[PDB]
From Swiss-Prot, chain B:
Keywords assigned: Cytoplasm, Isopeptide bond, Nucleus, Phosphoprotein, Proteasome, Ubl conjugation
A GO cellular-component term linked to this record: proteasome complex
Positions where Phosphoserine occurs in the chain: 13
Protein name as catalogued: Proteasome subunit alpha type-6
Described purpose of this protein according to its UniProt entry: The proteasome degrades poly-ubiquitinated proteins in the cytoplasm and in the nucleus. It is essential for the regulated turnover of proteins and for the removal of misfolded proteins. The proteasome is a multicatalytic proteinase complex that is characterized by its ability to cleave peptides with Arg, Phe, Tyr, Leu, and Glu adjacent to the leaving group at neutral or slightly basic pH. It has an ATP-dependent proteolytic activity.
Miscellaneous section: Present with 7210 molecules/cell in log phase SD medium.
UniProt cross-references to SUPFAM superfamilies, sorted A to Z: N-terminal nucleophile aminohydrolases (Ntn hydrolases)
Localization: Cytoplasm; Nucleus
From Swiss-Prot, chain E:
UniProt-recorded Gene Ontology molecular function terms: mRNA binding
Keywords: Acetylation, Cytoplasm, Nucleus, Proteasome
Compartments where located: Cytoplasm; Nucleus
GO CC terms, sorted: nucleus; proteasome complex; proteasome core complex, alpha-subunit complex; proteasome storage granule
Homology family: Belongs to the peptidase T1A family.
Protein name: Probable proteasome subunit alpha type-7
Anything else known: Present with 12000 molecules/cell in log phase SD medium.
Swiss-Prot record, chain F:
Official protein name in the record: Proteasome subunit alpha type-5
Function: The proteasome degrades poly-ubiquitinated proteins in the cytoplasm and in the nucleus. It is essential for the regulated turnover of proteins and for the removal of misfolded proteins. The proteasome is a multicatalytic proteinase complex that is characterized by its ability to cleave peptides with Arg, Phe, Tyr, Leu, and Glu adjacent to the leaving group at neutral or slightly basic pH. It has an ATP-dependent proteolytic activity.
Modified residues (Phosphothreonine): 47
Classification via SUPFAM superfamilies: N-terminal nucleophile aminohydrolases (Ntn hydrolases) (SSF56235)
Name of the coding gene: PUP2
Localisation per UniProt entry: Cytoplasm; Nucleus
Species for this entry: Saccharomyces cerevisiae (strain ATCC 204508 / S288c)
Subunit text: The 26S proteasome consists of a 20S proteasome core and two 19S regulatory subunits. The 20S proteasome core is composed of 28 subunits that are arranged in four stacked rings, resulting in a barrel-shaped structure. The two end rings are each formed by seven alpha subunits, and the two central rings are each formed by seven beta subunits. The catalytic chamber with the active sites is on the inside of the barrel.
Swiss-Prot record, chain G:
A Gene Ontology biological process term: proteasome-mediated ubiquitin-dependent protein catabolic process
Main localisation: cytoplasm
Higher taxonomy: Eukaryota, Fungi, Dikarya, Ascomycota, Saccharomycotina
Phosphoprotein recorded as keyword: yes
Residue numbers bearing the Phosphothreonine modification: 58
SUPFAM superfamilies: N-terminal nucleophile aminohydrolases (Ntn hydrolases)
Gene Ontology CC terms: mitochondrion; nuclear outer membrane-endoplasmic reticulum membrane network; nucleus; proteasome complex; proteasome core complex, alpha-subunit complex; proteasome storage granule
Residues annotated as signal peptide: none
Record-given protein name: Proteasome subunit alpha type-4
SMART domains in the cross-refs: Proteasome_A_N (SM00948)
Role, per record: The proteasome degrades poly-ubiquitinated proteins in the cytoplasm and in the nucleus. It is essential for the regulated turnover of proteins and for the removal of misfolded proteins. The proteasome is a multicatalytic proteinase complex that is characterized by its ability to cleave peptides with Arg, Phe, Tyr, Leu, and Glu adjacent to the leaving group at neutral or slightly basic pH. It has an ATP-dependent proteolytic activity.
Cytoplasm listed as a keyword: yes
Length: 243, 233, 86, 233, 243, 242, 241
């Protein structure tokens, strides 16, 4: 009966074997990214890695836009990443027409998590090999970040990260919050928040990136946009001048 | 051999092949042998009929679709009847809806869509019978070769069956002959007789064994059986 | 080092026949086209069966039908224990 | 074969269904050969130490050069062959190295060989897919169930033995019996002599043969009857 | 355990899929195909290996065109390659029905992307073992995409896969340094024929065939058609001159 | 333990190969088609003397001019006859005529291989193909008397003299030299019983064998037990001659 | 629902789901019956291991499909309730469609025909029970006794038994009973069934249930005291002879 490990069923150890391998699929691409909560907004950064020169830098992105008020960043292989991307855009449209006004961040992370829980419980569907991370600015609780696990468990984070080096990156964001005893960056301007997360990423990875080596998403209140090559390079200019 | 990797239809082999496609492909090579060729204004289809007993009859290996086109089968007989129903349905579909005859080029694409659905989904199976599609339209005569995977390629002529690949030697040396022969249907039919004769070992061509169906511009598709092919032996 | 190609098998079959005796009337490019994705040893094994067929028929040399009948026998991806034609 | 300048097959292939007396055919060859015969059990190659099985392989091929024109026979190779890969129980890597030692000693870098090698087992599907391909083996023969004409000769070789009543046709007994292995065919003649005690009979008659049909065959089917039951695993 | 490579939805212990990896090997067993992206449009080229002399010259069209603005060329199993275009043909017909104007290039890539993703999520179906290269001229600029068996795709300045993937696609890197500013559509036709002969070193054992098709706004003006007339024969002599 | 659509290495389905072997496991059905009529016969193979002659009927009637026999397992035969009479009697309503014998065989044989698990494109529910062999006979106004054979593999041939079941080998080869184009209706009745007598365990009687006939005027007719006994007594005189 | 097939041809040509299903009948209670000229008697036994079973509240082992015909089976009791209910609905459906009372010949081929469907229907399993249908056709006094096998093959029998120790009773009914001269009285038909139950029931009373079938829609079930009356008369002529 060696087929017990090939699907999702109760194991003799009381665990799930296929769920344990779902988290391991996100480390195949080896893409490190993090997200922090600003004062009035939220800024997310990601490492842009282009293996071949034949790839168009504008087409390759790990940050997808679900709606005008909500951004998204996903780690792991792109096919499972864009599979849940179009599923999240459909849930945001059904919520506007049927239910009411635009969807907030927590509802999108909860509906996509419950959708993966049905796929995990049912044995004829394999779980997604990626991790859904949604960033937006709510009109009630303000800036919030919800990271949806492939197992279907969503929980809020102050400053999150992703990748195999996440445990080394989390230490950087954790030690900063212990000394200041603050749960968010007190900088009001969103420009200083962009250069804030980039500074901690360079010192943690020990690598100075370029305009094409990073993709910085910016989620403001009721607006979301992705910084271009000139906007990302402009942030790296003031970083070398100050520090 | 038998079932190791690809015994399930949705499984891929580590060598980048599919044994289920290879299993159904070997069914044609062990089936009844048939040949074929075509010219600019004409196309000739020659098939050999066998059986398990001398007192038994010979099941026809040539199925008629419409007056302007026909086909032949090498493989399991009832599997070709299902594919022939899908081809004849498209002939009447284009005749009722589009008021046009089904083209040979478009018939191969529609036939490929039927086999690819069973291979890419569990519970189905690919048809292990081959189909040589002959016909004529305003463009000219066209011949196709169907495989269990559904591959469709236009050829001057080919052979599928037992020892059929070895019979292609006569078609290669004469490839420059029958293509330039127009208006001579008798010589084009006799060209296919010498091609299938290369695969004959035990029994030769007889009255009931030889089945020839010719199609062309001024001559529609007609199946010649019995003593009609006795003069072309 | 994948399986040999189409025209490549024509040269392999001809080399293993240098120690045999034939009439040199057999087209080697024709036998290679009758073989679809066979192992290198499966190619040499055809010449082994071709020699055993001539021993049963009493032929003094290996003819064309010896290589053709060898393919119908069990060599590469071909197994039949009975005719079975219906 | 030296006139044609060919290479005789080094190895052979005999598997067949269980119960056809395949081991009896291996002993029939050793009688006509009048030379050294070697019978090797599949479980004999595996020893109580790891790596000792590699030395057990060369023990067989060392006598090939020492004693020329002998015969080696392997029995139940399914317990040895097969790749079985890695991710399994983990204690399987010791057996897979026996074939890699056996293949190396058979066909290595130096083509060293003289005698004939015989591989035999009841499970051809569980073997190494490399072991199932030629170049170590040429002649491949798989046993089949004798037909009405085949099963008749099974009772004819046994008719010279035991006691056969004059005027009894054995073709009707093998006809009432369905397709079955030779192990159950010889059981008809053996059990027929058992009816001479309880059924109050002198020798084996036609009436006792009909009682054996519902006894030797129909009575012994039940469960745990192999014949063609297990062809695979 | 044993059998992780048997069915589809079963993940490997390292977080990958064997059936997806086995489908990649089926791509390199077919006829190779290349592509070239320019400013005005894209150029498609494919090398069709001729088996015997029984093939009729230039009566076989491997490239299946979607509407007038999208060509599609594939390298892999022929039956699996035609099912992708037939599925995309219905998506293009369903789009133009509701959405009026034809579907652009980056939009058409999402229809084939998600459709292949659904085959990897079921055990009753198998993924496509063919790599389809599609592109054309969209409403803004131009784009080129290559659909992999895993469903992963991005923008490509060039795309080549097949037996000559290690050769033909390696020559695409020299094309970028040759014309870093830009490349005309007419010159790209002659450059596409040379790349076929540069990777022909492994195809010299059989007979080949040259089929080139391009679409741009300079001449065809949104019309994807094969190259015929003296333009095709002119690119042959220019490509064979360096051979 | 596999799907019904799995192909064998020989290029065939496992359900098709093992279905042909089930024919010899049953009774023996022998029939001969002549120019004056088709003489069909079967063997009931009674395992106990208490079995009634009206119990097992291996020869049914599809039409007045069309009839068939069965051999082997009769469980799959009863289902096919319901579809055979459906494709026949209903075909009479459509064209206001009698269905061709060869055309009726095609409609019956096409229902064999349509089985499967979750067949795409339409709804086909069948667990296994029919493991019964049917010999289809009949008469028309064009080709004349014809005798076909419905195989589980979906193929059919026109046999002048065919023996299926346990007599598909020994009894089949005996009809090669005993058949002739001039064979009449009366001489064909004694020829079938001559083969059935040698292939039967006990003596030939009306209880262990049932024969039928298909003519142009009378059509399908089953021989009475008194009519069959008269042909058996005439057979004993033909066995002893010189 | 469940679309996976079950019955699969064995390499010998048989079917595993059939032969293995026949063993459930041989492990069940033996059901023996005979038919006379003017009467038909169907005997059945019960389980002798279980006790404290009230006969009145316990459903009868012989199910009545119609006034003129009943059904006494042997085999799995889980698969028998499916055949009994569907045979009685068709009995009323035949009276609705054709406005004709059912016949024993039509009832047997229907039950056997329905069993042929489940063997040929993917997703279901054959019945592991064998039914014996015996009765009289309307306006006909001829006895009708038909056997229904789980494989779908049906046949008529003068005297036939199914269940455990079947071959022992079958050999007893061939020599003792003659099909050429059946008994024309009801009393001789009842005593014949009791003689066949002496080698199976093995000295029991409450475990024996005998159902008498008579024409003109007349059914008389022998009580516990009426069955033991025929047992005493046979035992006196058994050991003494």
């Amino acid at each position: 009966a060696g087929y017990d490990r090939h699907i999702t069923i109760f194991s003799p150890e009381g665990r799930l074997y296929q769920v344990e391998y779902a988290f391991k699929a996100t480390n195949q691409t080896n893409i490190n990214s993090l997200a922090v909560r600003g004062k009035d907004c939220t800024v997310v950064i990601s490492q842009k890695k282009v293996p071949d020169k034949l790839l168009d830098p504008t087409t390759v992105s790990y940050i997808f836009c679900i709606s005008r008020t909500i951004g998204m960043v996903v780690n792991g292989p792109i096919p499972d990443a864009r599979n849940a991307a179009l599923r999240a855009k459909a849930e945001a449209a059904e919520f506007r027409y049927k239910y009411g006004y635009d969807m907030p961040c927590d509802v999108l992370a909860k509906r996509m998590a419950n959708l993966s829980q049905i796929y995990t419980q049912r044995a004829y569907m394999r779980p997604l090999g990626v991790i859904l991370t949604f960033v937006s600015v709510d009109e009630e609780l303000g800036p919030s970040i919800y990271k949806t696990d492939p197992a279907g468990y969503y929980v809020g984070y102050k400053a999150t990260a992703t990748g195999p080096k996440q445990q080394e990156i989390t230490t950087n964001l954790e030690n900063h919050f212990k000394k200041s005893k603050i749960d968010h960056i007190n900088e009001e301007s969103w420009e200083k928040v962009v250069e804030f997360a980039i500074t901690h990423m360079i010192d943690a990875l020990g690598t100075e990136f370029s305009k094409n080596d990073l993709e910085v998403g910016v989620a403001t209140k009721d607006k979301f946009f992705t910084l271009s090559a000139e906007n990302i390079e402009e942030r790296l200019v003031a970083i070398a001048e100050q520090d | 051999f038998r079932n190791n990797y690809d015994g399930d239809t949705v499984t891929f082999s580590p060598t980048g092949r599919l044994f289920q496609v290879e299993y159904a492909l070997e069914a044609i090579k062990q089936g009844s042998v048939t040949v074929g060729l075509r010219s600019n204004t004409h196309a000739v289809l020659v098939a050999l009929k066998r059986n398990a007993d001398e007192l038994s009859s010979y099941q026809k290996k040539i199925i008629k679709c419409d007056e302007h086109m026909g086909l032949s089968l090498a493989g399991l007989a009832p599997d070709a009847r299902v594919l022939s129903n899908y081809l004849r349905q498209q002939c009447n579909y284009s005749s009722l809806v589009f008021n046009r005859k089904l083209a040979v080029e478009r018939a191969g694409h529609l036939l490929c869509d039927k086999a690819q659905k069973n291979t890419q989904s569990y519970g189905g199976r690919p048809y292990g019978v081959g189909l040589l599609i002959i016909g004529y339209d305003k463009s000219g005569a066209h011949l196709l070769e169907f495989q269990p995977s559904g591959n469709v390629t236009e050829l001057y002529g080919t052979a599928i069956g037992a020892r059929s690949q070895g019979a292609k030697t006569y078609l290669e040396r004469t490839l420059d002959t029958f293509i330039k022969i127009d208006g001579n249907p008798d010589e084009l039919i006799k060209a296919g007789v010498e091609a299938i004769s290369q695969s004959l070992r035990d029994e030769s061509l007889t009255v009931d064994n030889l089945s020839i169906a010719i199609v062309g511009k001024d001559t529609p598709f007609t199946i010649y059986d019995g003593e009609a092919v006795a003069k072309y032996i | 080092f994948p399986l040999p190609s189409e025209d490549s098998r024509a040269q392999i079959l001809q080399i293993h026949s240098r120690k045999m005796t034939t009439d040199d009337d057999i087209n080697w490019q024709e036998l290679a086209r009758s073989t679809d994705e066979f192992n290198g040893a499966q190619l040499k094994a055809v010449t082994v069966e071709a020699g055993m067929i001539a021993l049963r028929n009493g032929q003094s040399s290996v003819k064309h039908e010896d290589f053709v009948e060898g393919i119908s026998e069990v060599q590469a991806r071909k197994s039949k224990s009975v005719s079975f034609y219906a | 074969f030296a006139t044609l300048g060919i290479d005789p097959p080094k190895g052979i292939l005999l598997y067949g269904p269980p119960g056809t007396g395949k081991t009896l055919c291996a002993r029939a060859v050793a009688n006509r050969t009048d030379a050294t015969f070697i019978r090797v059990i599949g479980s004999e190659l595996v020893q109580k130490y790891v790596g000792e099985g590699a030395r057990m392989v060369r023990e067989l091929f060392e006598m090939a050069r020492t004693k020329k024109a002998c015969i080696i026979f392997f029995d139940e190779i399914d317990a040895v062959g097969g790749a079985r890969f890695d991710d399994g129980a983990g204690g399987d890597n010791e057996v897979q190295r026996t074939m890699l030692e056996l293949i190396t000693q058979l066909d290595g870098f130096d083509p060293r060989g003289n005698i004939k090698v015989m591989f035999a087992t009841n499970r051809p599907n569980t073997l190494d897919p490399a072991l199932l391909r030629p170049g170590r083996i040429d002649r491949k023969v798989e046993f089949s169930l004798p037909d009405l004409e085949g099963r008749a000769n099974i009772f004819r070789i046994h008719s010279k033995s035991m006691s056969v009543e004059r005027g009894i046709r054995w073709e009707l007994i093998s006809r009432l019996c369905p397709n079955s292995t030779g192990a159950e065919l010889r059981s008809v003649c053996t059990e027929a002599g058992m009816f001479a005690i309880r059924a109050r009979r002198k020798v084996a008659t036609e009436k006792d043969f009909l009682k054996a049909v519902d006894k030797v065959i129909s009575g012994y089917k039940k469960f745990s009857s192999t014949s063609r039951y297990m062809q695979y695993n | 355990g044993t059998g992780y490579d048997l069915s589809n939805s079963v993940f490997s212990p390292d977080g990958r899929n064997f059936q997806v990896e086995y489908a990649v090997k089926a791509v390199e067993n077919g006829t190779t195909s290349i592509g070239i992206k320019c400013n005005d449009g894209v150029v498609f080229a494919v090398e069709k290996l001729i088996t015997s002399k029984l093939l009729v010259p230039q009566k076989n069209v491997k490239i299946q065109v979607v509407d007038r603005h999208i060509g599609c060329v594939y390298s892999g199993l022929i039956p699996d390659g035609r099912h992708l275009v037939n599925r995309g043909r219905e998506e293009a017909a369903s789009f133009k029905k509701l959405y009026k104007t034809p579907i652009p290039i980056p939009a058409f890539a999402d229809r084939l992307g998600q459709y292949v993703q659904a085959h990897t999520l079921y055990n009753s179906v198998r993924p496509f073992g063919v790599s389809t290269i599609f592109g054309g001229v969209d409403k803004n600029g131009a784009h080129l995409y290559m659909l992999e068996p895993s469903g992963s795709y991005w923008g490509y300045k060039g795309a080549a896969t097949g037996k000559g993937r290690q050769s033909a696609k390696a020559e695409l890197e020299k094309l970028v340094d040759h014309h870093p500013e830009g490349l005309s559509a007419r010159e790209a036709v002659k450059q596409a024929a040379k790349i076929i002969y540069l990777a022909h070193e492994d195809n010299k054992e059989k007979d080949f065939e040259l089929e080139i098709s391009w679409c741009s706004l300079s001449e065809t003006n949104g019309l994807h058609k094969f190259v015929k007339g003296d333009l095709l024969q002119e690119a042959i002599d220019f490509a064979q001159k360096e051979i | 333990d596999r799907g019904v659509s799995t192909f064998s290495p020989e290029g065939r389905l496992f359900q098709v190969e093992y279905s042909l072997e089930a024919i010899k496991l049953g009774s023996t059905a022998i029939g001969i088609a002549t120019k004056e009529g088709v003489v069909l016969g079967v063997e009931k193979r009674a395992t106990s003397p208490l079995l009634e002659s009206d119990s097992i009927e291996k020869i049914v009637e599809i039409d007045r001019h069309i009839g068939c026999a069965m051999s082997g397992l009769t469980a799959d035969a009863r289902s096919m006859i319901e579809h055979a009479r459906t494709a026949a009697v209903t075909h009479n309503l459509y064209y206001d005529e009698d269905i061709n014998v060869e055309s009726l065989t095609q409609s019956v044989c096409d229902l064999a291989l349509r089985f499967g698990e979750g067949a795409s494109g339409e709804e086909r529910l069948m667990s296994r193909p029919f493991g019964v062999a049917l010999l289809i006979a009949g008469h028309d106004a064009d080709d004349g008397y014809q005798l076909f054979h419905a195989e589980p593999s979906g193929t059919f041939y026109r046999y002048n003299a065919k023996a299926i079941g346990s007599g598909s080998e020994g009894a089949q080869a005996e009809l090669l030299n005993e058949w002739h184009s001039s064979l009449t209706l009366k001489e064909a009745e004694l020829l079938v019983l001559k083969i059935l007598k040698q292939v039967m365990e006990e003596k030939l009687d009306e209880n262990n064998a049932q024969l039928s006939c298909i003519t142009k005027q009378d059509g399908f007719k089953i021989y009475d037990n008194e009519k069959t006994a008269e042909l058996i007594k005439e057979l004993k005189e033909k066995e002893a001659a010189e | 629902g469940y679309d996976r097939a079950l019955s699969i041809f064995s390499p010998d040509g048989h079917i595993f789901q059939v032969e293995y299903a026949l063993e459930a009948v041989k492990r069940g209670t033996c059901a023996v019956g005979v038919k006379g000229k003017n009467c038909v008697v169907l005997g059945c036994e019960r389980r002798s291991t279980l006790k404290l079973q009230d006969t009145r509240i316990t459903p009868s082992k012989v199910s009545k499909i119609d006034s003129h015909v009943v059904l006494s089976f042997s085999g799995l009791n889980a698969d028998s309730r499916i055949l009994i209910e569907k045979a009685r609905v068709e009995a009323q459906s035949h009276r609705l469609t054709l406005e004709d009372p059912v016949t024993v010949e039509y009832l047997t081929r229907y039950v056997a025909g329905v069993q042929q469907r489940y063997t040929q229907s993917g997703g279901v399993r054959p019945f592991g029970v064998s039914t014996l249908i015996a009765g009289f056709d309307p306006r006909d006094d001829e006895p009708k006794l038909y056997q229904t096998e789980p494989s779908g093959i049906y046949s008529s029998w003068s005297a036939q038994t199914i269940g455990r120790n079947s071959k022992t009773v079958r050999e007893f009914l061939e020599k003792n009973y003659d099909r050429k001269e059946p008994p024309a009285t009801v009393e001789e038909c009842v005593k014949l069934t009791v003689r066949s139950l002496l080698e199976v029931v093995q000295t029991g009373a409450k475990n024996i249930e005998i159902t008498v079938v008579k024409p003109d829609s007349d059914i008389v079930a022998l009580s516990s005291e009426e069955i033991n009356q025929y047992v005493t008369q046979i035992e006196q002529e058994k050991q003494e002879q």
